[PDB]
Write a protein that binds this ligand. Structure first.
Ligand SMILES: Nc1ncnc2c1ncn2[C@@H]1O[C@H](COP(=O)(O)OP(=O)(O)O)[C@@H](O)[C@H]1O
Ligand code: ALF
Length: 795
């Protein structure tokens, strides 16, 4: 797949060493190369060139620290390569550098290539590799930037990374789940790769923690700053622009709050102290950010502005807040949102230069807080908050919320300025808030569901999940991991013996949560891709329905209208999405009339459309579809069948099942007991159900359990995609004991055999995956899927 660079053989030779040495000497007479070197010599890392190379050359593992923008990411790789080339051994270099995000790997590779007077990829010295996109460099004497997900995928093809000579783990402070896994895998690999060199780099790092973890490996600090960046706290921001607004650590904040205000009145005007007193800790003040942006463009010198917001809802709100003003309507401004859910083509536009009279304003999430360098950025506005997932071990409920930024994230955000020229960073938290921020975010492995952790451990054949936990830098609790094992068994991704099923193999290859991965996989298998990807896109992110202040009743009636007779919150989103695409074909004014009439968010709908393309790419790289288009005819033969779609929904949401009792309707969920239906759902006032079963995705606990989104489902969908099957008594079938319904006992025998055929189908798909040819009709794989579909259609 994406392992072309990996599965090459590292074959150094002296003749290619001489060609690289001569080419390097020829570069030193090229004007463009010479001018780039003038810029490189200004970086603090350039002064450490001999010291950095000598340490990497004498030690297997090296921890490199340095100030933001000191040059690690773009220079250290070049220092290793150019040192080898100058020593006459350049062909022995196969340097791989990991980046946490795709926008980092692309832009850094393009920048390094330009610093070497070369294009990126094209068999030159530098290139990049990401999911389904690559610019690959030459075989020997080369640098490859990639994502950590790429390296994890490589470990499935070569657990030893045999052809790589240097692996550079960058931004290691970003303790994301995959990075911690990769870091532990690299540590185990050292003894099996005595020839491999490992470099660990971060600008904001407890470097002794990583040194100690890697056997007290040597540390080296790159001293110096590139350009000064002035910092401002909330009181300083309010003082400068004269702005007037139109768990235990919080107890400390409240205790020190009155004394802090007193000490503040001695250093700031009373107006600003009163404003600090009434500022809101719950959400980011978008009006203040807009007012600060107005002040910068009207009173400060030229330079792009970069704004950090928690999520997409804040970005679009601020964007509309600016665009509603006459000043920002003109072509003197180019306002660019930046979100990880945007297509990579859209993310790269942030790096395009602006005309001299044009001010660039980038509104980004934490996607932009590390690695990347934006040329004209001079002003950084730090909203002070960051989206974080959190996990509670009392119920299967994980929450994503906007938390206070840590000091490391703040330093990384400040570091986006001061790279090519001086800059200013504005932090929207007061000084008392600053003293109570944490140094780093809690590692993601300690606060998220761990289903992907267990799938990753199993697909990489790393051994027992207990032994691997003991090797992690920060191991999660056993109960959290055991809870993930149980969830993966209920999804039938693991069998009773904690071993990957055929389905579990494909789910581990899909870079999404297995509930979503199982849904889009069977949407591709059952040829109903487009409606399922729309449902999957809305289960991730959010649904596109909004409720203005009112008068929720008229918005309710619109939602039930879009549901038709489906009794499905998820088919409602599909109908709302399909009507939106058709409204767009009519015209822009009529598209707005559609969104206003049905209380739909065009911004959310466009975001959902982007995510559908990303899901199809995942299925394309996994071999289950033939193109990146979610509406490919080859994947949508059954896209108009509500029963088949609802089965795929059930395939994804099981075991989140609810039972309906009548006479007056009551709902039960085995784990929570009696639940209720969220008033936003279309099934709140429903008393007529064709079936007594619902599937759901989101649960909200407010002293009462509400199912946010649910669809009625036939017991035969639960029978096939459920758990254990038992026949009771006096002729009933049971699914996981509690799901009981009267049915001929031989149906249970049929489902056991069809499940087995489905496993055989997925097993044959493991080696070389190709999409099911739904035009063959007379094929084994199509006959199996048709038999399952026939069972779903009729009892
Ligand atoms: N696309 C670019 N345009 C202009 N200058 C750049 C670009 N990319 C990097 N630089 C310069 O090269 C330096 C290298 O940055 P980087 O290697 O990312 O440093 P670090 O990894 O320490 O943050 C930056 O400080 C910046 O000044
Ligand atoms: F150290 Al950086 F972007 F990686 F400032």
């Amino acid at each position: 797949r994406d392992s072309e660079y990996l599965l090459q053989e590292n074959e150094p030779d002296a003749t290619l060493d001489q060609q690289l040495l001569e080419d390097l000497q020829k570069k030193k007479t090229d004007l463009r190369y010479i001018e780039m070197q003038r810029f490189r010599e200004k970086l603090p890392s350039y002064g450490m060139q001999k010291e950095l190379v000598n340490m990497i050359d004498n030690h297997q593992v090296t921890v490199i620290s340095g100030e933001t923008g000191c040059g690690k990411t773009t220079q250290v790789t070049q220092f290793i390569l150019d040192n080898y080339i100058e020593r006459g051994k350049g062909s022995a270099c196969r340097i791989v550098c990991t980046q946490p995000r795709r926008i980092s790997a692309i832009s850094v590779a393009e920048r390094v290539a330009a610093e070497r007077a070369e294009s990126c990829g094209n068999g030159n010295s530098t290139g990049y590799q990401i999911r389904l996109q690559s610019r690959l460099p030459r075989k020997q004497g080369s640098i490859l930037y990639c994502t950590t997900g790429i390296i994890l995928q490589w470990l499935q093809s070569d657990p030893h990374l045999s052809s790589v000579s240097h692996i550079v783990l960058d931004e290691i402070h970003e303790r994301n789940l995959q990075s911690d896994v990769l870091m532990t895998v690299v540590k185990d690999l050292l003894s099996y790769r005595p020839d491999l060199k490992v470099v660990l780099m971060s600008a904001t790092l407890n470097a002794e923690k990583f040194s100690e973890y890697f056997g007290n490996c040597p540390m080296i600090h790159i001293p110096g700053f590139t350009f000064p960046v002035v910092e401002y706290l909330l009181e300083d921001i309010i003082e400068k622009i004269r702005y007037v607004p139109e768990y235990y650590y919080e107890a400390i904040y409240k205790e020190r709050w009155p004394g802090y205000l007193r000490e503040l009145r001695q250093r700031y005007s009373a107006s600003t102290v009163d404003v600090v007193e009434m500022m809101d800790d719950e959400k980011v003040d978008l009006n203040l950010i807009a007012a600060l942006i107005r002040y910068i463009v009207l009173e400060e010198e030229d330079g792009a502005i970069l704004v950090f917001l928690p999520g997409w809802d804040n970005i679009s709100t601020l964007h509309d807040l600016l665009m509603s003003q006459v000043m920002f309507k003109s072509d003197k401004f180019i306002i660019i949102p930046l979100h990880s859910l945007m297509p990579t083509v859209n993310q790269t536009q942030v790096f395009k230069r602006t005309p001299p009279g044009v001010r660039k304003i980038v509104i980004a999430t934490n996607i932009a807080e590390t690695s990347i360098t934006i040329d004209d950025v001079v002003y950084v506005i730090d909203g002070g908050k960051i989206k974080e997932t959190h996990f509670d071990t009392q119920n299967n409920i994980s929450t994503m919320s906007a938390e206070w930024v840590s000091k490391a994230n703040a330093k990384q955000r400040k570091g986006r300025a001061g790279r090519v020229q001086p800059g200013h960073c504005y932090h929207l938290y007061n000084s008392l808030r600053a003293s109570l921020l944490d140094d780093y975010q809690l590692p993601e492995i300690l606060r998220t569901p761990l289903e992907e952790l267990c799938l990753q451990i199993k697909i990489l054949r790393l051994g027992g999940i207990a032994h691997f936990l003991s090797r992690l830098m920060d191991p999660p609790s056993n109960e959290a991991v055991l809870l993930s094992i149980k969830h993966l068994m209920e999804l039938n991704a693991l069998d009773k013996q904690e071993e990957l099923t055929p389905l579990g193999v494909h789910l581990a290859r899909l870079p999404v949560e297995p509930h979503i991965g199982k849904m889009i996989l069977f949407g591709a298998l059952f040829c109903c891709l487009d409606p399922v990807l729309t449902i999957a896109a809305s289960l991730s992110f959010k649904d596109p329905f909004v409720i203005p202040l009112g008068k929720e009743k008229v918005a309710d009636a619109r939602r039930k209208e879009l549901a038709k007779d489906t009794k499905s919150d998820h088919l409602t989103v599909v109908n709302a999405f399909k009507g939106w695409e058709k409204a767009k074909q009519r015209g822009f004014r009529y598209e707005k009339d559609y969104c206003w009439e049905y209380f739909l968010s065009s911004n959310t709908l466009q975001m959902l459309h982007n995510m559908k393309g990303q899901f199809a790419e995942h299925l394309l790289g996994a071999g289950f579809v033939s193109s990146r288009n979610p509406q490919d005819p080859e994947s949508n033969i059954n896209s108009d069948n509500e029963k088949i779609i609802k089965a795929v929904i059930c395939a994804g949401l099981y075991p989140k099942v609810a039972k309906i009792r009548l006479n007056m309707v009551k709902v039960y969920t085995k784990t929570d007991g009696v639940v209720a239906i969220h008033p936003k759902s279309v099934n709140v006032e429903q008393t007529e159900f064709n079936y007594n079963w619902l599937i759901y995705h989101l649960k909200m606990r407010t002293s009462s359990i509400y199912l946010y989104d649910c669809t009625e489902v036939s017991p035969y969908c639960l029978l096939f995609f459920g758990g254990d099957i038992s026949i009771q008594k006096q002729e009933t079938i049971a699914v996981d004991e509690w799901i009981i319904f009267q049915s001929p006992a031989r149906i249970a025998h049929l489902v056991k055999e069809l499940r087995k055929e489905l496993d055989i189908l997925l097993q044959e798909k493991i080696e070389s995956p190709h999409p099911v040819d739904w035009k063959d009709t007379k094929s084994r794989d199509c006959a199996v899927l048709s038999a399952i579909i026939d069972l779903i259609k009729t009892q």
